């Protein structure tokens, strides 16, 4: 047959790429040597095309102007601190070790110094639960208990733009505008609606996947479609 | 370094090189790793010098153990060019051997003894 869509993606052609030339910046944490003597002022609030959420422009003491992964409640004029001795306040960044237990955090680093990997989307937040000298236990937005190095930096508060998912797109055209801002081919044609040559579910008079949808983890690309290694399906049970 | 098992003080090395210089003007010395090797093998060597900046180390690796099983005493020199100059060469020398000293027999003998104490 012919390579299915999921395989066309891999090639990374224009159709499947994200509009990077239109993107603003990666909201990574500042790199401070030590001393914490790095504070700045929120100079402006901007819209981030890549995340459909507001982001804050900060002007630091040492003359650095950088965009920041902004939590809810950050406003122009406000002073932000980044470092070990940072004040425990919303919008401030400091290692998990310096953060008190039971405090909502966002833009959490996976490995100290990476700039932040977890809890970055609209309205989400990680919850700092347990402390230690060797490991900080954080509950991620998915509900997973994650063990992290206490030296991993994070921002206090939840990510701005919460509730975005609460309003329906209502019309195709609205979805359209959003997809243009992402690395995604849209709209979506069902496998069962294509010819047998184009997808494992294509062909046959009436539309129907002529086989069970739960596919093995070991299935090769081109065959791995439908319900990937499902532990179960449906709503019952 | 893989062949070096002890550090020789800069002062001992100075004396040793001076001893080597008067050994060539008076007695006889061997210049070059091959010639030095045969001396230790024929037993004609009284004191062998080995540079420490020899790359690759293969060239000299064998000297230390070969000298040990032949009773022949050895000493290290930090630089290859110095050993070569002391032997009276425009070029460097990875290893050298004072085959029968000359008007420095007492000095050479002391140097050997100073090394023994130094492991």
């Amino acid at each position: 047959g012919r390579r299915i869509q999921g395989q066309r993606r891999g090639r990374g052609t224009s159709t499947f790429r994200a509009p990077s030339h239109r993107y603003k910046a990666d909201l990574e944490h500042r790199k401070v040597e030590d001393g914490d003597v790095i504070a700045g002022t929120v100079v402006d609030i901007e819209h981030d095309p890549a995340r459909s959420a507001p982001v804050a422009a900060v002007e630091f003491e040492d003359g650095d102007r950088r965009l920041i992964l902004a939590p809810e409640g950050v406003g122009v004029g406000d002073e932000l601190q980044v470092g070990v001795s940072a004040e425990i306040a919303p919008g401030n960044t400091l290692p998990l070790a310096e953060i008190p237990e039971g405090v909502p955090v966002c833009n959490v680093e996976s490995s100290p110094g990476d700039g932040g990997k977890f809890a970055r989307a609209s309205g989400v937040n990680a919850q700092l639960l347990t402390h230690d000298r060797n490991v900080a236990v954080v509950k991620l937005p998915s509900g997973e208990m994650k063990r992290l190095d206490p030296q991993c930096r994070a921002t206090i508060g939840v990510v701005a733009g919460g509730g975005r998912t609460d309003k329906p797109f209502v019309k195709a055209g609205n979805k359209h505008h959003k997809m243009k801002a992402r690395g995604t081919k849209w709209p979506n044609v069902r496998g069962v609606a294509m010819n047998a040559v184009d997808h494992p579910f294509g062909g046959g008079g009436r539309q129907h996947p002529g086989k069970p949808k739960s596919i093995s983890r070991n299935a090769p690309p081109g065959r791995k479609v439908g319900d990937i290694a499902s532990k179960r399906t449906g709503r019952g049970g | 370094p893989v062949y070096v098992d002890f550090d020789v003080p800069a002062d001992l090395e100075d004396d040793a090189l001076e001893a080597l210089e008067v050994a060539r003007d008076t007695g006889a010395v061997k210049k070059g790793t091959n010639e030095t090797t045969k001396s230790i093998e024929r037993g004609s060597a009284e004191l062998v010098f080995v540079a420490e900046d020899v790359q690759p180390e293969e060239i000299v690796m064998h000297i230390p153990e070969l000298a040990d099983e032949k009773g022949v005493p050895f000493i290290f020199v930090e630089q290859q060019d110095d050993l070569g100059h002391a032997a009276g060469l425009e070029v460097g020398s990875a290893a050298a051997a004072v085959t029968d000293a000359g008007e420095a027999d007492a000095d050479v003998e002391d140097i050997a003894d100073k090394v023994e104490e130094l492991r």
């Binding site: - | 893989v2 790793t33 090797t37 093998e41 690759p56 180390e57 293969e58 690796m61």
Partner: protein, 194 residues
């Protein structure tokens, strides 16, 4: 008596034992951080180089080349083939890694000609070989009685035509009798059945 060289030789007979083992363990850390072709001032295996034709003269160059370890890196068939011509994983190339190394070196030094080469070890993912190259245009070599032969026109790009010792061995030209029916005088003239 034994030459000093015989000791370098004897050490290299068992690269995994003695001082050589520690030397290699140290060196490879540096080699892995080096490029594909690194010119070196002195051969790592002096005895082997001199034995192969090396001389501490002008126009003699030694370079260490690293090549990925293992079999062929082959692309699977687009069009239809019989099961016999479908395989992809176990198929290996007909040229050995040492030969690939010699060619990469000669390409880096276009004006020079490959004289010979030898192995200097390998790790789990790559192999290293040191190639001896000669400058056929330098008078110190045109006047050398033991090397001036490499200056001849027919010796140009000798490595690319399989004229190196590794080339000749790989072409099955070692044996003068039984087994060399399809190798001598050339693989091509014997219908490429060697």
């Amino acid at each position: 008596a034994r030459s000093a060289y015989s000791y370098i030789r004897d050490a290299w007979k068992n690269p995994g034992d003695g001082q050589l083992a520690e030397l290699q363990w140290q060196r490879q850390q540096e080699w892995r951080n080096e490029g594909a072709v690194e010119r070196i001032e002195r051969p790592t295996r002096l005895d082997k180089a001199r034995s192969q034709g090396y001389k501490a003269k002008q126009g003699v160059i030694v370079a260490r080349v690293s090549v990925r370890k293992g079999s062929a890196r082959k692309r699977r068939h687009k069009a239809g083939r019989r099961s016999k011509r479908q395989g992809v994983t176990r198929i290996t190339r007909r040229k050995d890694i040492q030969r690939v190394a010699e060619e990469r070196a000669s390409r880096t030094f276009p004006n020079l000609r490959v004289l010979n080469s030898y192995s200097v070890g390998q790790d789990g993912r790559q192999k290293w070989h040191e190639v001896i190259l000669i400058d056929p245009n330098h008078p110190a070599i045109q006047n050398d009685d033991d090397l001036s032969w490499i200056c001849a026109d027919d010796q140009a790009d000798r490595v690319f035509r399989g004229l190196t010792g590794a080339g000749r061995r790989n072409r099955g030209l070692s044996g003068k009798g039984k087994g060399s029916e399809k190798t001598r005088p050339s693989l091509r003239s014997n219908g490429g059945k060697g």
